[PDB]
Amino acid sequence: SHMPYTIELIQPEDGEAVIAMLKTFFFKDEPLNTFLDLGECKELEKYSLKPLPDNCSYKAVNKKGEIIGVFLNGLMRRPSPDDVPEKAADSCEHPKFKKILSLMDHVEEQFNIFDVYPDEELILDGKILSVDTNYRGLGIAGRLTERAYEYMRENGINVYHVLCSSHYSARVMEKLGFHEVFRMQFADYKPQGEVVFKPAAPHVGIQVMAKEV
Ligand SMILES: CC(=O)SCCNC(=O)CCNC(=O)[C@H](O)C(C)(C)COP(=O)(O)OP(=O)(O)OC[C@H]1O[C@@H](n2cnc3c(N)ncnc32)[C@H](O)[C@@H]1OP(=O)(O)O
Ligand SMILES: OCCc1c[nH]c2ccccc12
Ligand SMILES: OCCc1c[nH]c2ccccc12
Ligand SMILES: OCCc1c[nH]c2ccccc12
């Protein structure tokens, strides 16, 4: 049997298994990744492992011990009064991944989640969410998300922030009790005067989603 599954804290020694799962699914089937045909992307591998030592990322593991879902989260801190805002895309050599990092930089230049919550110093950031295709539609995304609420409660974190790359994923977060705090249509994202991302019409654009727990 493959069911039931558990939800467990991701450990540093899980890095290779996490990357293997993401390469099978997220790298190929997150909408922007598939639109670009990301391919091999060691920089996304490194990006995905970065939040693990924050000790608040979760894996769904089936009855055979295989990872069938992950939600990789990191703590984000309010920029210091003397902050030097850096563009993440400036340190990326992979051209396709750079386009995604540039989109993230653009969102952050237009919208600062910390402006919404002036009293908060630390906010949980949901960075990478992926569920194995054969296990989709079972509520695993919600159970991964709910495990983060436990971490938030234990540590007095009030806000969970998730940048969603498609209305499809934003709708999942809405079902889980998140609400939109910022949006941008792909048709309106023209950093150098021209559209960069043209996925299918139902995706629409990015929505930053937030929940206060
Ligand atoms: C911060 C970020 O990572 S943003 C990018 C988010 N990740 C991606 O886009 C990667 C590709 N997508 C996925 O991995 C998954 O679709 C996820 C993680 C978004 C959702 O995971 P799931 O555990 O399937 O979520 P859930 O069980 O709530 O199903 C969501 C919706 O998918 C639909 N769905 C239903 N059955 C299936 C199925 N077999 N396969 C795919 N979708 C299904 C339903 O519309 C369902 O909503 P509903 O059950 O409330 O009616
Ligand atoms: O918040 C953005 C989530 C995301 C969508 N596509 C990606 C590719 C690499 C890393 C993160 C993302
Ligand atoms: O191919 C679309 C992949 C997808 C991304 N987010 C979702 C949410 C629900 C169902 C499918 C998706
Ligand atoms: O259902 C689509 C709702 C929507 C309106 N404007 C947007 C911009 C980005 C993502 C989604 C939307």
Author numbering: 18 to 230
The authors write:
Acetyl coenzyme A (Ac-CoA)-dependent N-acetylation is performed by arylalkylamine N-acetyltransferase (AANAT) and is important in many biofunctions. Dopamine N-acetyltransferase (Dat) is the first identified insect AANAT from Drosophila melanogaster. Dat exhibits an ordered sequential mechanism in which the cofactor (Ac-CoA) binds first, followed by the binding and acetyl transfer of the substrate. Overall structures revealed that Dat was a globular protein containing a tunnel-like cavity, a substrate located in the middle of the protein, a CoA group located at the bottom, and an acetyl group between the substrate and CoA.
